[PDB]
Amino acid sequence: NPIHDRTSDYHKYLKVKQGDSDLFKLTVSDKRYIWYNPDPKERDSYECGEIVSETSDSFTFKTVDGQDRQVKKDDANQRNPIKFDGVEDMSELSYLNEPAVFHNLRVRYNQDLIYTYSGLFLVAVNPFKRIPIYTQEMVDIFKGRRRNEVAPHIFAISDVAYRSMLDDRQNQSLLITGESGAGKTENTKKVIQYLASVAGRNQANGSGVLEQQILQANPILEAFGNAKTTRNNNSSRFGKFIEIQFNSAGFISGASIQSYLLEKSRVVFQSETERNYHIFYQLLAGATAEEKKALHLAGPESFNYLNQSGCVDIKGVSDSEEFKITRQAMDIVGFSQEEQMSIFKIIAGILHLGNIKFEKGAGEGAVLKDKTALNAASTVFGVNPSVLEKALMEPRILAGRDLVAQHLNVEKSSSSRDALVKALYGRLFLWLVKKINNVLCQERKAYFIGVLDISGFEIFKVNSFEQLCINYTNEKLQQFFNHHMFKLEQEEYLKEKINWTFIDFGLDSQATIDLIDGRQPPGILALLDEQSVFPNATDNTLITKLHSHFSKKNAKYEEPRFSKTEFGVTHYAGQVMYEIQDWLEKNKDPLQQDLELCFKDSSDNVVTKLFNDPNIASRAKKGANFITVAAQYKEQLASLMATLETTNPHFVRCIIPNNKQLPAKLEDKVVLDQLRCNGVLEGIRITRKGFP
Ligand SMILES: [Mg+2]
């Protein structure tokens, strides 16, 4: 049993190192310690001090320099017996408090133990380096093993959900929380590898045909769905709910991917030092000189969609290599060779579209002096350049019932070009996901385990509509933790009359949630939608309206005095200032119909499907108008949350060590902020003072 063999890799990489004769002596000491703040200003910077004396209501302890300090016993953060240092489940700690909890995660983290239980759920501190704890060898250890029987691991909570699914015959869900960069996607890939292995077929041929395809779907979506942001070199710029499906027997019958809220503005814009989607750099770097020639490609610095941020490389990543990986994954999944080259036709097409330079004509209307990029794009898309040209600068609209040809100025033409690009990319992504799902959908399930991997809470210097939707989602996920851990739990206790005193854990994001998606009174998304369908609305009337409804009326809202285009939302993870520029158009998400009539005619079999498939090209109507991005998203989310509620949820709290993407650098302020807003200690408390 490698578990019991102190020389195994299991003990080496997943267990706390044996202490020595000098640590034993410290461990049996009778002295008592307290966590304190040398600088009261810096409440998260702690030092250890020895308790030197005590009165009935206080402790007197010695600081590190040597000074003596008094504190009330009620405000004292006592240090646990150091035999607790490194303990695998912090519900076992005698003193549950912020420095004690952080300290324990520190001790474990200092020896590359990134997993720690926190009562009913798992905590995972991002190591920002590789640790050899996800081999098939490690997988096999956790099989069938009970949580208390093995060390904290993501494999272990995965196992627990599996058994619970088989024993209770109830669908399960793995909810992995975290801010951007914390580790949600890595752990997500782990849950699936472990479910695929312990539950994959095992005698010939299928066994990990399906299983392997399930596996190969992620690298597909990461190349198209992930990019470098200032907070994570592999940021997930779309959310996903993965259904891993099983039969009554417990074998994998299939899997389903639901995608959410792809950041299509990334394709046309990138803040400084960020990148566009990985796929763009992979192609330009991984294509043969031949395809390079067929797709009229050249270096990233030659494309407008790629040469603005000042970054085209990710340290330690080789795009040309990831290109090979994406391709092999598409082959496994089943992307025909014709389909694959259409896909990069779209990718190269998008790049040429971005190179189009609109100029002012004699009139205020725009002209296209150089048709080079126009013709190149037309060429790879399989569309008529002059139709596309007219569609871009002179689109036709209805004025009443009349048919009026417009002539957009430079600005408008560029925005329209950008709209095309974003529709192409987003429809493509939706198509890739559709195609994957056919492949993994080949049998009615009896049960499933759902893994939720969303875009995590983020803050940039500039926060737009995309970030509101991201942070609102993160706020609902946190509320789902609150609900289940504290609310649903005590509701039983009071229900089953065990006597029982209700406790308020002070965790509730409802006011923030309501401020955003409230219907009556109307919240931010609702006012947005209103303005969005108001013929005379501007970004300026929108913010004014927001201020009018919430400023000095909603406790979670702030009208800043330093700007007239931003508003602050107080989220669980902190206050975020949002810039109102472009929200109306972002919400409306418009595309000129002449553009679509121009692509519906393409000769490419992939492109044609992006503009004729009702499931990709059609838009629901909210009466006289098309549904908005906001109304649509709010609807897709509510459905996900309703589905979650019909599962047994397992929470993994992912935690970022610092804001630098660095290993071996656990910063207390950063970590403690997360522990607080995540509700980790409260989580341990409910578990301890309760009846699970
Ligand atoms: Mg991610």
CA of 234 to the centre of ligand 1 (A): 7
The angstrom resolution of this structure is 2.3
Which listed residue (236, 253, 414, 628) is catalytic? Answer: 236
The partner residues of 99 in beta bridges, in order of sequence, read none
Structure token pair of residue 649: 């949820």
- Topology of the domain comprising 459-589+620-646: Methane Monooxygenase Hydroxylase; Chain G, domain 1 (1.20.58)
CA of 401 to the centre of ligand 1 (A): 47
184 phi, psi to nearest 5 deg: -60, -45
Query: DSSP states of 437-496 as a string?
Result: HHHH--S--SEEEEEEEPPPB---SSB-HHHHHHHHHHHHHHHHHHIIIIIHHHHHHHHT
350 exposure class (CB count in 10 Å sphere: 0-12, 13-18, 19+): buried
Report how far residue 661's alpha carbon sits from residue 663's, in angstroms, rounded to the nearest whole number: 7
User: Left if phi > 0, otherwise alpha if psi is -120 to 50, otherwise beta: which for 623?
Assistant: left
Report how far residue 628's alpha carbon sits from residue 212's, in angstroms, rounded to the nearest whole number: 37
Structure token pair of residue 628: 């908005």
- Topology of the domain comprising 32-79: SH3 type barrels. (2.30.30)
Looking at residue 19, the DSSP 8-state letter turns out to be P
Position 317: which residue type? V
Report how far residue 89's alpha carbon sits from residue 120's, in angstroms, rounded to the nearest whole number: 9
Looking at residue 47, the DSSP 8-state letter turns out to be E
The answer to whether the CB of 210 falls within 8 A of the CB of 252 is: yes
User: Reading across the β-sheet that carries 68-72, which strands appear in turn?
Assistant: 68-72, 58-62, 47-54, 33-36, 77-78
The answer to whether the CB of 254 falls within 8 A of the CB of 445 is: yes
Report how far residue 345's alpha carbon sits from residue 376's, in angstroms, rounded to the nearest whole number: 11
Position 23: which residue type? L
Q: Which of 225, 221, 120, 131 is nearest to 175 (CA)?
A: 120
The partner residues of 452 in beta bridges, in order of sequence, read 175, 241
Which listed residue (229, 235, 342, 509) is catalytic? Answer: 235
Rg of the chain taking only CA atoms, in angstroms: 28
Q: Is the dihedral of CA 87, 90, 94, 95 positive or negative?
A: positive
Q: Which of 146, 229, 235, 144 is nearest to 186 (CA)?
A: 235
Q: Is 458 a residue of the active site?
A: yes
Distances (CA, A) of 338 to 330, 334, 600: 12, 11, 19
CA of 188 to the centre of ligand 1 (A): 9
310 exposure class (CB count in 10 Å sphere: 0-12, 13-18, 19+): exposed
Which listed residue (86, 181, 286, 382) is catalytic? Answer: 181
Query: Residue 434 in 3-state DSSP?
Result: helix
Q: Is 682 a residue of the active site?
A: no
Q: Is 551 a residue of the active site?
A: no
Q: Which of 640, 651, 638, 644 is nearest to 686 (CA)?
A: 651
Where do we find the tokens 């804001």?
659
Report how far residue 676's alpha carbon sits from residue 477's, in angstroms, rounded to the nearest whole number: 15
Q: Which of 533, 5, 461, 416 is nearest to 230 (CA)?
A: 461
Distances (CA, A) of 566 to 103, 186, 546, 576: 39, 34, 10, 10
CA of 235 to the centre of ligand 1 (A): 5
641 phi, psi to nearest 5 deg: -60, -30
Q: Which of 228, 235, 364, 378 is nearest to 306 (CA)?
A: 228
The answer to whether the CB of 171 falls within 8 A of the CB of 155 is: no
Question: How many Cβ atoms from other residues are within 10 Å of residue 536's Cβ?
Answer: 6
Please enumerate, as own/partner, the contacts of 247-250 that have beta carbons within 8 Å and a separation of 24 or more: 247/443, 247/445, 247/446, 247/447, 248/446, 248/447, 250/162, 250/165, 250/166, 250/199
Terminal Cα-to-Cα distance of the chain (whole angstroms) = 31
Q: Is the dihedral of CA 465, 470, 471, 477 positive or negative?
A: positive
Altogether, the residues listed in the chain come to a count of 692
CA of 475 to the centre of ligand 1 (A): 16
Q: Is 247 a residue of the active site?
A: no
Exposure pattern of 468-477 as b/e (b: 16+ CB <10 Å)?
Answer: bbbbbbbbbb
Give the rounded distance of the alpha carbon of 183 from its chain centre.
9
Query: Residue 69 in 3-state DSSP?
Result: strand
CA of 398 to the centre of ligand 1 (A): 43
CA of 278 to the centre of ligand 1 (A): 13
Structural domain boundaries of the chain?
A: 1-31+80-458+590-619+647-692, 32-79, 459-589+620-646
Report how far residue 220's alpha carbon sits from residue 259's, in angstroms, rounded to the nearest whole number: 13
The partner residues of 236 in beta bridges, in order of sequence, read 226
Report how far residue 281's alpha carbon sits from residue 279's, in angstroms, rounded to the nearest whole number: 6
User: Left if phi > 0, otherwise alpha if psi is -120 to 50, otherwise beta: which for 303?
Assistant: beta
Q: Is the dihedral of CA 527, 529, 530, 534 positive or negative?
A: positive
CA of 38 to the centre of ligand 1 (A): 37
Residue 167 CB contacts under 8 Å (≥ 6 apart), including other chains:
none
Q: Which residues are annotated as a binding site for ATP?
A: 178-185
Distances (CA, A) of 659 to 112, 155, 231, 574: 18, 27, 7, 15
Which listed residue (254, 456, 523, 679) is catalytic? Answer: 456
Report how far residue 345's alpha carbon sits from residue 435's, in angstroms, rounded to the nearest whole number: 18
Q: Is the dihedral of CA 308, 309, 314, 315 positive or negative?
A: positive
Query: DSSP states of 518-529 as a string?
Result: -TTTT-HHHHHH
Angle between helices 184-199 and 154-168 (to 10 degrees): 50
Exposure pattern of 382-415 as b/e (b: 16+ CB <10 Å)?
Answer: bbebebbbebbbbbeeeeeeeeeeeebebebbbe
CA of 63 to the centre of ligand 1 (A): 42
Method: X-ray
Structure token pair of residue 602: 């393409």
Position 431: which residue type? W
Report how far residue 615's alpha carbon sits from residue 596's, in angstroms, rounded to the nearest whole number: 15
Distances (CA, A) of 533 to 196, 545, 586, 588: 47, 14, 13, 8
Angle between helices 465-482 and 629-645 (to 10 degrees): 20
Residue 289 CB contacts under 8 Å (≥ 6 apart), including other chains:
none
Report how far residue 106's alpha carbon sits from residue 108's, in angstroms, rounded to the nearest whole number: 5
Question: How many Cβ atoms from other residues are within 10 Å of residue 249's Cβ?
Answer: 9
The answer to whether the CB of 652 falls within 8 A of the CB of 157 is: yes
Q: Is 318 a residue of the active site?
A: no
Report how far residue 222's alpha carbon sits from residue 398's, in angstroms, rounded to the nearest whole number: 40
CA of 387 to the centre of ligand 1 (A): 40
Report how far residue 596's alpha carbon sits from residue 420's, in angstroms, rounded to the nearest whole number: 8
Q: Report the run of H or E that residue 576 belongs to, with start and end.
A: strand 574-579
Report how far residue 312's alpha carbon sits from residue 320's, in angstroms, rounded to the nearest whole number: 12
Angle between helices 629-645 and 524-532 (to 10 degrees): 150
Q: Is 236 a residue of the active site?
A: yes
Query: DSSP states of 593-645 as a string?
Result: HHHHHHHTT-S-HHHHHHHH-HHHH---EETTEEPPHHHHHHHHHHHHHHHHH
Q: Which of 490, 485, 488 is nearest to 503 (CA)?
A: 490
Structure token pair of residue 94: 């005698």
Structure token pair of residue 483: 């609900």
Report how far residue 453's alpha carbon sits from residue 188's, in angstroms, rounded to the nearest whole number: 6
75 exposure class (CB count in 10 Å sphere: 0-12, 13-18, 19+): exposed
Q: Is 235 a residue of the active site?
A: yes
359 phi, psi to nearest 5 deg: -130, 160
Residue 313: half-sphere exposure toward Cβ, Cα within 13 Å: 5
Which listed residue (171, 232, 602, 687) is catalytic? Answer: 232
Q: Which of 327, 238, 239 is nearest to 282 (CA)?
A: 327
CA of 226 to the centre of ligand 1 (A): 8
Report how far residue 3's alpha carbon sits from residue 11's, in angstroms, rounded to the nearest whole number: 7
Q: Which of 336, 305, 503, 510 is nearest to 435 (CA)?
A: 336
Give the rounded distance of the alpha carbon of 468 from its chain centre.
13
Which listed residue (98, 274, 458, 682) is catalytic? Answer: 458
Q: Which residues are annotated as a binding site?
A: 178-185
User: Left if phi > 0, otherwise alpha if psi is -120 to 50, otherwise beta: which for 57?
Assistant: alpha
Structure token pair of residue 111: 């020896």
Query: DSSP states of 189-210 as a string?
Result: HHHHHHHHHHHS--STTTTTTH
User: Left if phi > 0, otherwise alpha if psi is -120 to 50, otherwise beta: which for 68?
Assistant: beta
Report how far residue 523's alpha carbon sits from residue 24's, in angstroms, rounded to the nearest whole number: 59
Q: Which of 402, 371, 342 is nearest to 608 (CA)?
A: 342
Which listed residue (104, 118, 185, 378) is catalytic? Answer: 185
User: What distance separates the 2 farthest-apart alpha carbons in the chain?
Assistant: 91
Structure token pair of residue 319: 């795009």
Q: Which of 460, 529, 516 is nearest to 637 (CA)?
A: 516
The partner residues of 123 in beta bridges, in order of sequence, read 116, 653
Structure token pair of residue 449: 């385990």
Report how far residue 692's alpha carbon sits from residue 688's, in angstroms, rounded to the nearest whole number: 9
The answer to whether the CB of 33 falls within 8 A of the CB of 15 is: no
Q: Is the dihedral of CA 86, 91, 92, 96 positive or negative?
A: positive
CA of 664 to the centre of ligand 1 (A): 21
Report how far residue 304's alpha carbon sits from residue 421's, in angstroms, rounded to the nearest whole number: 13
Q: Is 378 a residue of the active site?
A: no
Q: Report the run of H or E that residue 377 belongs to, with start and end.
A: helix 372-381
Report how far residue 586's alpha carbon sits from residue 520's, in angstroms, rounded to the nearest whole number: 23
Report how far residue 3's alpha carbon sits from residue 8's, in angstroms, rounded to the nearest whole number: 8
Where do we find the tokens 């504290």?
486
CA of 678 to the centre of ligand 1 (A): 18
